[PDB]
RNA sequence: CGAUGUUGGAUCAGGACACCCAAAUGGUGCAACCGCUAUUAAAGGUUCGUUUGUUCAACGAUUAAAGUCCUACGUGAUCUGAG
RNA sequence: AACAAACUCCUAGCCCAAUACCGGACUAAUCUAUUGAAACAUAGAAGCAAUAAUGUUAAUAUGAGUAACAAGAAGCCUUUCUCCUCGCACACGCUUACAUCAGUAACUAAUAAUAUACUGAUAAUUAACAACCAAUAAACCAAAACAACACUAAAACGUUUAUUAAUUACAUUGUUAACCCAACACAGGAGUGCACCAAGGAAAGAUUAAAAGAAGUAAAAGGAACUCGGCAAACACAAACCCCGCCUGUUUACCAAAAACAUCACCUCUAGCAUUACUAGUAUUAGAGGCAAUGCCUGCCCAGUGACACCAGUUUAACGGCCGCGGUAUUCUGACCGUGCAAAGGUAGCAUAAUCACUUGUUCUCCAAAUAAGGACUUGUAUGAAUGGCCACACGAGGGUUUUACUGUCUCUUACUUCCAAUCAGUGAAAUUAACCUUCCCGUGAAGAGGCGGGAAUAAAAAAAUAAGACGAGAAGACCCUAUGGAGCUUUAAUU
RNA sequence: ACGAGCUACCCAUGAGCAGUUUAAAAGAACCAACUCAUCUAUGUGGCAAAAUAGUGAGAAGACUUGUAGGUAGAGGUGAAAA
RNA sequence: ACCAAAGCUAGCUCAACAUACUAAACAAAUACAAAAAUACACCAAAAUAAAAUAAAACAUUCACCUAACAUUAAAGUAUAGGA
């Protein structure tokens, strides 16, 4: 007469486990683009002229 | 069989009904607007209009006086029925009372309910259901028909 | 008194599929004019009754707070102003509560 | 007999007719009133009390009459429990 | 004639029904040996095949979204109202269920709101109260009862003197609670001290106002006509008489509270006595019993059976017993007579009884009427004297009877409230159940039919009501019998 | 083997009994607390594996009751109801 | 489409061997009311196993039934038994 449900499901993101991580995670990439190149208002226009 | 009876049956018993109007009506004294259940209000309701009546009798009539001393519960309203809710009930035969139905209690039980209130109270106004005005396409019709009765008189 | 046999599942859902076992549809149903919300047509609309509700009770609160205590309530009439409002010549000589907020297009002067 | 719970009451009575009452008749050792018999008829009726656990039975008072029976000696998933 | 079968023809065949027991041929699924390799073959082996055990376990239906369960009102949201009254503490017990903050989709609350009860985190009851907290000698006959002084059943509770008792701040331990025992957040069970409110609490989730059921208040005229019985009820709360037990008391926890038991009293038996009972007693005592206070009594019997006396003999307030047949007073009776048998022949009393049957004995009283009650008569041929007999006071939730009074018990029912109820919302059981597409009549039949035969009837589905049937549900009938089945009890059973 | 934390009877040790009536604490009387469990109705898978409501019986005693201890199944205990 | 379904592991069983047979863990505390450091004592002991059952009952009897001696035979023979 007594038996409960289980798997209630949560995340819990804390610092302490992500801290002491022994293989630290290993990045093939940077998130972010240093350096935006910002391009000619007339791009446009300088696109029919070849040289 | 139930032929003729005017009066519901509450409480624990006739008695405990008029306790429950008691508190009732006080509180309808008091704060001149309430909520509760739409049978109780519907039972309140001929009481809540005759004790305007008893006010209107006066301070100096003994009878008004020990009837508002039994109904009116919390002492201090006494002077309020008759210096304040009588008063601003005189041309006014019977009018004092709107009671309108409230959508059900959003509490399981999911009761009727309903809004009492003595009018000319000072509260933001209830949203009464406004009839549709003259413009309205089938009121115009009508309006012509008057004006034909005007006109053939 | 127990029953002799189980009742099979085409007399149950005899029984309970009958029509009168039914929910019903309720045809009083429409628009409030004011918000826009559901309401049947006999009975207040909810939506716009909570709107007074709050109102009310901030009122009452404020009208409270003007009582020290329990059982002193006026002896004379109540008048509610708002924001940027003086008490008519008519309207002096009763009690009179001041809400912060600018009065409510839905509530008229009076 | 891996249960068809049993007497008398209560309540509600369904039926038979081999009729107690009411109706129609035949015979009389039927003058009349009473009666005694027999035929036909079952729609409707068929009391209240004292004692017995009682059914019977005795007794008091009446009634147009206080019928004889069948229904798991009708009826306890309706009652009673005196036996 | 026809129509009409497991008969018989016809066309083909694999070429003739069956319960207990018996014989045979095949075979599912596993495993092992060799094959085989889109799941097989030949052999060898086995925990070798489930529509039936009130089978076991798990899971699911049905009954059923039924029975049943709960939170006083408003409001400015914890402030006022309306009601009801088991309160605070300690002991015992429980063991963190207590406190603060947060969370509650779901889990606990028989439902929510939210939280004393679910979840998590964090905290907490601080000794002065309580526990722990000397021995050996010696003087003390003298109750507690407001204790002056006494009663009988003779009574819990300490001083002082002497001899030694480590001597030196702060030891140790109990301190929460809404709590415990009842499988439950159970109308039950629970010691003490103070209180009757200053403390504690809420009968209604919302409606409606059908039946039936529960609980109450009122009732015209009548007043027990009810009924086994004045059971219950009542504006009554009184009187009398019997039976049985003397009395207060005790008993079958859970169907019997009594007339049963005990009991004061009276009687029998058995004991002449010392360190664990009886008894720190000693025959005016102590055991084993009977009977039931008091009063009048307790008659006759020792042959049997016991027990003493180990045999004689003695014992009935030990087990137990206590009779006939014939003839007689003119007549029914039988003082008398005869005779048989016994150990004695039933005495006094009482009596149709709580007393085999006959029995509703007979008669009087009581009632309009009585198998009731009371009083007499009484062979009761089956009463009867400590397995006690007869009167009697007082007493009795004992069993019967009368009178008054009172009444809804009844004539003969009625009105209204509350709980149930029905509708709305939430949660959500039980016995039960071969399958059901689950009519009525008469017939039939394992002898009482929804299901067979012959007829009748017949759109389908809910909801509310009634209980005639489903030989309705419950419990492998307690009655009865059987079993070379038990057990309890008693002996003059048999072995000891 | 285990059981007397229920209950039967004991042993120790504590605790209760107000008002009224009586020369009286007399197994007297009235009537609470307290203890029982008479009669009825509810209830009958119930609030309850014995209760609720009313009504009753005792209520200074052969009284109720707390705590600790005892007696054990061929037994115990018993104001006998096996 | 819900409720559900499917795994192959955890370990077990029976023997063989084997040394030899009360494992592991012990700081403190543990036989005061076990887990409570610390005061004059006591302490200890044994008596046949019985019955259900079989004998179609039951009364003498009824293998095995917590006592080391195995194996192949003699042999279910001699014997014993309400024979
Ligand atoms: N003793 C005996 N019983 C028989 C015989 N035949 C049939 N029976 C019994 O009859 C019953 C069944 O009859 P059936 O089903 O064979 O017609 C069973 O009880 C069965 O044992 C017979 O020959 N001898
Ligand atoms: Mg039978
Ligand atoms: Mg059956
Ligand atoms: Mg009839
Ligand atoms: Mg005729
Ligand atoms: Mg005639
Ligand atoms: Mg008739
Ligand atoms: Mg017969
Ligand atoms: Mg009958
Ligand atoms: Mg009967
Ligand atoms: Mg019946
Ligand atoms: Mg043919
Ligand atoms: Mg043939
Ligand atoms: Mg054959
Ligand atoms: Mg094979
Ligand atoms: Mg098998
Ligand atoms: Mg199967
Ligand atoms: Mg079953
Ligand atoms: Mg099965
Ligand atoms: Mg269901
Ligand atoms: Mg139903
Ligand atoms: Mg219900
Ligand atoms: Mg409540
Ligand atoms: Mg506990
Ligand atoms: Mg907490
Ligand atoms: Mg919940
Ligand atoms: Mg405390
Ligand atoms: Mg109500
Ligand atoms: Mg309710
Ligand atoms: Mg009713
Ligand atoms: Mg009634
Ligand atoms: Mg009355
Ligand atoms: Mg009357
Ligand atoms: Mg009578
Ligand atoms: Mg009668
Ligand atoms: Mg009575
Ligand atoms: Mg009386
Ligand atoms: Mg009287
Ligand atoms: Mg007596
Ligand atoms: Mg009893
Ligand atoms: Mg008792
Ligand atoms: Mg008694
Ligand atoms: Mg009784
Ligand atoms: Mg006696
Ligand atoms: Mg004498
Ligand atoms: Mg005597
Ligand atoms: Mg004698
Ligand atoms: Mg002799
Ligand atoms: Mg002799
Ligand atoms: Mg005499
Ligand atoms: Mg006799
Ligand atoms: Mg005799
Ligand atoms: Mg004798
Ligand atoms: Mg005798
Ligand atoms: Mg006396
Ligand atoms: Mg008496
Ligand atoms: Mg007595
Ligand atoms: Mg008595
Ligand atoms: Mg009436
Ligand atoms: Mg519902
Ligand atoms: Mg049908
Ligand atoms: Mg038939
Ligand atoms: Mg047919
Ligand atoms: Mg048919
Ligand atoms: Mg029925
Ligand atoms: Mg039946
Ligand atoms: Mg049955
Ligand atoms: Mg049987
Ligand atoms: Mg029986
Ligand atoms: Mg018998
Ligand atoms: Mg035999
Ligand atoms: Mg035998
Ligand atoms: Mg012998
Ligand atoms: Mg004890
Ligand atoms: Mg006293
Ligand atoms: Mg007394
Ligand atoms: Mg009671
Ligand atoms: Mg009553
Ligand atoms: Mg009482
Ligand atoms: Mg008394
Ligand atoms: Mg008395
Ligand atoms: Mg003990
Ligand atoms: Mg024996
Ligand atoms: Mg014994
Ligand atoms: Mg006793
Ligand atoms: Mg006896
Ligand atoms: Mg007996
Ligand atoms: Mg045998
Ligand atoms: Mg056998
Ligand atoms: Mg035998
Ligand atoms: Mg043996
Ligand atoms: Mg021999
Ligand atoms: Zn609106």
């Keep these: ?51 | 069989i139930s032929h003729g009876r005017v009066f519901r049956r509450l409480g624990l018993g006739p008695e405990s009904r008029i306790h429950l109007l008691q508190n009732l009506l006080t509180g309808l004294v008091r704060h001149e607007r309430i909520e509760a259940s739409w049978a109780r209000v519907d039972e309140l309701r001929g009481y809540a209009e005759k004790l305007i009546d008893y006010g209107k009798l006066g301070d100096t009539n003994e009878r008004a006086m020990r009837m508002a001393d039994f109904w009116l519960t919390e002492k201090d309203l006494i002077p309020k029925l008759f210096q304040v809710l009588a008063p601003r009930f005189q041309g006014q035969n019977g009018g004092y009372t709107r009671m309108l139905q409230i959508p059900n209690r959003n509490e399981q039980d999911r009761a009727k309910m309903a809004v009492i209130e003595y009018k000319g109270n000072c509260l933001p106004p209830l949203p009464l259901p406004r009839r549709d005005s003259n413009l309205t396409l089938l009121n115009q019709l009508l309006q012509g028909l008057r004006q034909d009765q005007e006109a053939s008189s | ?110």
């Design chain 1, 1 to 51: 007469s007594e038996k409960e449900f289980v798997e209630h499901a949560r995340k819990a993101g804390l610092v302490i486990p992500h801290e002491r991580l022994e293989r630290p995670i290993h990045l093939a990439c940077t998130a972010g683009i240093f350096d935006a190149y910002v391009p000619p208002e007339g791009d446009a226009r300088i696109s029919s002229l070849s040289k």
């Design chain 3, 1 to 110: 008194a127990a029953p002799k046999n189980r009742r099979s599942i085409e007399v149950n859902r005899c029984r309970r599929r009958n029509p009168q076992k039914l929910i019903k549809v309720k045809n009083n149903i429409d628009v409030c004019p004011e918000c826009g919300h559901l309401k049947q047509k006999h009975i207040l609309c909810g939506y716009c009754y909570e709107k007074v509700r709050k109102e009310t009770a901030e009122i009452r609160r404020q009208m409270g707070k003007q009582e020290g205590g329990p059982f002193r309530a006026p002896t004379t009439e109540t008048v509610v102003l708002y924001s940027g409002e003086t008490p008519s010549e008519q309207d002096q000589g009763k009690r009179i509560i001041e809400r912060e907020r600018k009065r409510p297009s839905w509530f008229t002067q009076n």
